[PDB]
Design an enzyme around this catalytic site. Structure first.
Site, PDB file in Angstrom:
ATOM      1  N   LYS B 159      -2.678  31.019   0.498  1.00 17.40           N
ATOM      2  CA  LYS B 159      -1.400  30.664   1.109  1.00 17.40           C
ATOM      3  C   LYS B 159      -0.618  31.854   1.663  1.00 17.40           C
ATOM      4  O   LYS B 159      -0.071  31.749   2.768  1.00 17.40           O
ATOM      5  CB  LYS B 159      -0.525  29.900   0.112  1.00 17.40           C
ATOM      6  N   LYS B 185     -11.445  30.322   0.892  1.00 16.73           N
ATOM      7  CA  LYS B 185     -11.413  30.090   2.344  1.00 16.73           C
ATOM      8  C   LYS B 185     -10.534  31.043   3.147  1.00 16.73           C
ATOM      9  O   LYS B 185      -9.386  31.287   2.770  1.00 16.73           O
ATOM     10  CB  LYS B 185     -10.945  28.651   2.598  1.00 16.73           C
ATOM     11  N   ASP B 187      -8.008  32.069   6.040  1.00 20.19           N
ATOM     12  CA  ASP B 187      -7.020  31.302   6.788  1.00 20.19           C
ATOM     13  C   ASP B 187      -7.536  31.109   8.210  1.00 20.19           C
ATOM     14  O   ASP B 187      -8.128  32.015   8.793  1.00 20.19           O
ATOM     15  CB  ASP B 187      -5.661  32.008   6.764  1.00 20.19           C
ATOM     16  N   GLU B 188      -7.332  29.921   8.766  1.00 20.57           N
ATOM     17  CA  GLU B 188      -7.809  29.636  10.112  1.00 20.57           C
ATOM     18  C   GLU B 188      -7.239  30.593  11.150  1.00 20.57           C
ATOM     19  O   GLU B 188      -7.963  31.041  12.039  1.00 20.57           O
ATOM     20  CB  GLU B 188      -7.449  28.206  10.493  1.00 20.57           C
ATOM     21  N   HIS B 278     -14.270  24.032  10.608  1.00 19.35           N
ATOM     22  CA  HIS B 278     -12.856  23.742  10.477  1.00 19.35           C
ATOM     23  C   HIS B 278     -12.423  22.762  11.555  1.00 19.35           C
ATOM     24  O   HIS B 278     -13.017  22.684  12.629  1.00 19.35           O
ATOM     25  CB  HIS B 278     -12.028  25.015  10.575  1.00 19.35           C
ATOM     26  N   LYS B 318      -2.576   5.839   1.992  1.00 19.52           N
ATOM     27  CA  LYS B 318      -1.401   5.609   2.823  1.00 19.52           C
ATOM     28  C   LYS B 318      -1.220   4.140   3.167  1.00 19.52           C
ATOM     29  O   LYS B 318      -0.094   3.630   3.149  1.00 19.52           O
ATOM     30  CB  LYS B 318      -1.494   6.439   4.112  1.00 19.52           C
TER      31      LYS B 318
END
EC number: 4.1.1.39
Lengths: 207, 456, 79, 451
Positions: B159, B185, B187-188, B278, B318
């Protein structure tokens, strides 16, 4: 040789009555020599896990790969969940030699719906593909809360669940087309309730 | 007196098993019937002509022609229809996704007679799925390479994205990896940028991976982002990541393209690296319910082109229709034969002919109290990515990793033993949070959510 | 057990010994499943599992090697 | 084992299954059903039982299934057997794998006298993974710019003991006369009396001269068969650098790996490929053991090749003539229906893969021109041996004789005349305005018979 920082390990694991006073080397030499059947020495590897013995180390010592280890543990757990409830010994005396690869697929069903699944899968000699598709069809049943003729297939038995799967898959078509006939005939070949049967005959024939 | 059949809308025509089928949901502007709207959609995706003026000069222009063979209305909505169109197998190049895309969705979306157009599904024949390569490894092979059997995999994303040095990034990666997770992972947005170039990040991450893996006794991995401005640069990054000994890399198939993704998939196949795809810049296309390209089509095109992992987004719930659609296109990329089920979203019966599967990745704002549901929805062939659910633990990164690991193991054990996970979940986690203080703190931090699914 | 060296049915190709099963019954425990007599010196003692079939009461067949017939790369010599 | 589990007589085969048709003759005492099941089991997992396959319930996904054992009429103790193999047993782009998986060790079975492989059916799913011919028929007819008639070629008979200088002069004489292709002998590669670079040099020189002089497009098949792959690629690269439009190869002595490699090179570099079929009677001459030639023609159309030798049909009795017409149709066309009278066993659909060009050869002269022109049609090449080099005047007169005869016959066919009855009449009314054709008609006295 302890491998550092495995803080996620459980406290311990239970061991059968006959092995409650053995060391690690005893477990090793009883696993390596196959001096029991699978549901006797599956708790032994399940317990050896919690002493810092990684699946590669047990594979190096005993000689069973990690996939077989996991399959055996899960199969023994499913069998122990079966035997402790309403059952009949036609199957416990049949799951003695080579029944783990089939017990590994009904693991998705709760203990309430496992004895019926075991009966259905051993009565007709079904392999892992059919067992997987049967378990998936059983688990897909409560989602279809409302459809064409849903309450006519009972869900306290696997034959009617799989028959309802086939029946709802056949309705994605029109007038016979020679493809619906195969699906309906395969549906009537597995159902085992008279209400599902008379509905299937009401729709496939005469009307 | 009557237009001669429109030559494109042929209702009584069943399509052969070597035709490519496509399903459009369209809504036409007031004053246009649906029949010729469908016929025009069929004529635009191919030779843009109803007539026969541009042919008959020793030519058969009816072998390169689409045919709208079915039109129906959408139940529950007025002025919106489903049109089915069947294209031959000769219009398409063997082994190219770019060509299929630019041949179907090239000009038709700008047609001026329709008010809106959406591409809901598509069906490839076996004769066409046999000319592509598919995933480099698959599911069984990548489960054997990492040696992780009988549980979902665990991963953490970092993060504190930017402004963090490469050495610091390596230390956080190490702390997370030795705590009990499997994958970390990149970060993109992280490429070679002025505050953190790529080679330094690669070096320190590889060092951390080697340290933690050697001291913990299993296999750890990090997805290294090898997205580059050019193909040549991409190849340098991938080759240096292989030289260090990394098991898995990362790409981005909607901003980089399909040519670069196919090239990278072939490289990964030849050099034994896993590939994680991704899912970025996708809501620009598949968000509005009345225009664009449903993500199901792109998942199919990705399973064709190449890639071992694919993002799908957690669907813990949802609304039952949307979760049904998500389960539909999650089973459209693990199984080998999928039957038509218009409630799940599948329109055609798709057969894959022994092409391997693709692991779905659940991600985004999930924490410990969600672990039961996930374990019973996605199953055991999946990855679970955690964001703030790991770095936010009250006392560090490694205890957060350990909390997540303990929760996952407890849930899968309680599933194997027979109990259910829609009514006994919270009790399972509270029973497991007694012999472990990390899990107890993690349970005290995040608030338990009450599931109210199909319990009856 | 039978003493057919390698023989088929009178006209068929099905091997006579196993009758096309590809498997026979153990000749030490006679399908019983547990050992009967101490065999070597005492490391295989009676009462435990059979020393040969390891408790399956079913072994492979020599003449027809797991192939229900006679001929081929499993039961015969390659030229 | 009363249940065979491999002979499923009611099984219908899918559209993604590879079918094979054997003709076998069982030993005395063995029935037919069990021999069919054994042929199905030998060419797959060689077991009837399930003592290994039942490892973890992974059964019968990789086994063949006999489903038809009809007998063949006329002969007795001889049967047909149809077998269906799944698609996930074979890899893509490899013909060696198909051959090894099917005919690997079934022919060495002990309980059969003899076994022959008559036909085979590839599904479209498998046809679409091979490259196919580099160019085809339309493309190779547009590259050379020769429409509406067969093509003409000559083979050079004084094979051995000829310097490269004289070789080039002979090639120039023949090509200048009016032929299209000259052919290099099958067994002339790099012998010490004539190396290959010299031959290539002088042949290229002659081609350039004759083509710049006559206006048409000329060609000479240059044999690139080599001991290894490096030498083969060196020869091909040199023949391309000189500017040659076509090369030659032997797919049965060099193999299928080398032929596939050469076909991919030829596609990438725009060269045409001509396939010579030496060493083929070793496999398929006897009607009771071997591999029929149509199976090899199919495998060739899959791996690569533009022309293919097929042999004349002017003097075959029947059936054999029908068989050759059948497997010429299997090469040139795109969809072939099952017609057992002319060999074809299964319906084959090629999924718009290009065609292959038949070649006739073997000692034919001008009097055979009508028949050929109406049997093979206009999509073929006609190779002449002594029919061009034996003219009393030379090589260029023989070339012009053959050219005149061919164009006369094709012009007479266009008008609607019949070539069976009055072919010789056409040749005779054509051999009046030209001395060469008259000399040819007077030397080859073969006016045998027609209709």
């Amino acid at each position: 040789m302890q491998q550092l920082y495995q803080p996620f390990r459980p406290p311990s694991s239970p061991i059968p009555t006959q092995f409650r006073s053995l060391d690690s080397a005893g477990k090793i030499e009883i696993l390596a020599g196959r001096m029991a059947l699978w549901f006797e020495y599956a708790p032994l590897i399940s317990s050896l896990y919690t002493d810092g013995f990684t699946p590669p180390t047990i594979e190096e010592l005993t000689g069973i790969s990690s996939i077989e280890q996991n399959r055996l543990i899960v199969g023994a757990q499913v069998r122990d969940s079966i035997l402790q409830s309403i059952h009949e010994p036609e199957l416990i005396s049949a799951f003695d030699t080579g029944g783990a690869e089939l017990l590994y697929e009904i693991r998705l069903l709760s203990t309430t719906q496992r004895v019926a699944a075991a009966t259905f899968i051993i009565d007709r000699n079904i392999d892992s593909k059919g067992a997987q598709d049967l378990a998936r069809a059983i688990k897909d049943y409560p989602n279809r809360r409302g459809d064409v003729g849903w309450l006519d297939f009972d869900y306290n038995l696997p034959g009617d669940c799989l028959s309802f799967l086939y029946y709802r898959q056949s309705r994605e078509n029109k007038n016979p087309s020679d493809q619906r006939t195969s699906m309906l005939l395969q549906a009537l070949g597995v159902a085992e309730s008279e209400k599902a049967k008379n509905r299937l005959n009401t729709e496939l024939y005469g009307d | 007196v009557k237009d001669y059949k429109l030559t494109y809308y042929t209702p009584d025509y069943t399509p052969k098993d070597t035709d490519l089928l496509a399903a459009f949901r369209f809504s036409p502007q007031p004053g246009v019937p649906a029949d010729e709207a469908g016929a025009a959609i069929a004529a635009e995706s191919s030779t843009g002509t109803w007539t026969t003026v541009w042919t008959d000069l020793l030519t058969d222009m009816d072998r390169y022609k689409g045919k709208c063979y079915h039109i129906e209305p959408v139940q529950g909505e007025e002025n919106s229809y489903f049109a089915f169109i069947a294209y031959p197998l000769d219009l398409f190049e063997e082994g190219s996704v770019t060509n299929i895309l630019t041949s179907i969705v090239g000009n038709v979306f700008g047609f001026k007679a329709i008010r809106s157009l959406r591409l809901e599904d598509i069906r490839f024949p076996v004769a066409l799925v046999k000319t592509f390569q598919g995933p480099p490894h698959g599911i069984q092979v990548e489960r054997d390479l990492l040696n992780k059997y009988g549980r979902p995999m665990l991963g953490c994303t970092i993060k504190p994205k930017l402004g963090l040095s490469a050495k610091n990034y390596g230390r956080a990666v190490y702390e997370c990896l030795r705590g009990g997770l499997d994958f970390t992972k990149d970060d993109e947005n992280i490429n070679s940028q002025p505050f953190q170039r790529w080679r330094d990040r690669f070096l320190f991450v590889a060092d951390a991976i080697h340290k933690s893996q050697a001291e913990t006794g299993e296999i750890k991995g990090h997805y290294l982002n090898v997205t580059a401005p050019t193909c040549e640069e991409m190849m340098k990054r991938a080759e240096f990541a292989k030289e260090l000994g990394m098991p898995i890399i990362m790409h981005d198939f909607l901003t980089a393209g399909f040519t670069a993704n196919t090239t990278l998939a072939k490289w990964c196949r030849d050099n034994g690296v896993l590939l994680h795809i991704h899912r970025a810049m996708h809501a620009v296309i598949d968000r509005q319910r009345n225009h664009g390209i449903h993500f199901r089509v792109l998942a199919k095109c990705l399973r064709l082109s190449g890639g071992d992992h694919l993002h799908s987004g957690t669907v813990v719930g949802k609304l039952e229709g949307d979760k049904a659609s998500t389960l539909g296109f999650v089973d459209l990329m693990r199984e080998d034969h999928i039957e038509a089920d218009r409630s799940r979203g599948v329109f055609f019966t798709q057969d894959w002919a022994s092409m391997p599967g693709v692991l779905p990745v659940a991600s985004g704002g999930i924490h410990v109290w969600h672990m039961p549901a996930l374990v019973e929805i996605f199953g055991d062939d999946s990855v679970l990515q955690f964001g703030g659910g790991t770095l936010g633990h009250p006392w560090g990164n490694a205890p957060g990793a350990t909390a997540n690991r303990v929760a996952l193991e407890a849930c899968v054990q309680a599933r194997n033993e027979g109990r259910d996970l829609y009514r006994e979940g919270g009790d399972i986690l509270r029973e497991a949070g007694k012999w472990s203080p990390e899990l107890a703190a993690a349970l005290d931090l995040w608030k338990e959510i009450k599931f109210e699914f199909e319990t009856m | 057990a039978n003493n057919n060296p390698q023989g088929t049915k009178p006209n068929s190709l099905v091997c006579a010994n196993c009758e096309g099963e590809g498997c026979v019954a153990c000749s030490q425990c006679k399908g019983g499943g547990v050992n009967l007599i101490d065999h070597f010196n005492g490391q295989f003692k009676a009462g435990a599992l059979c020393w040969l079939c390891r408790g399956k009461k079913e072994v492979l067949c020599g003449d027809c090697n797991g192939a229900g017939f006679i001929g081929g790369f499993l039961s015969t010599f390659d030229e």
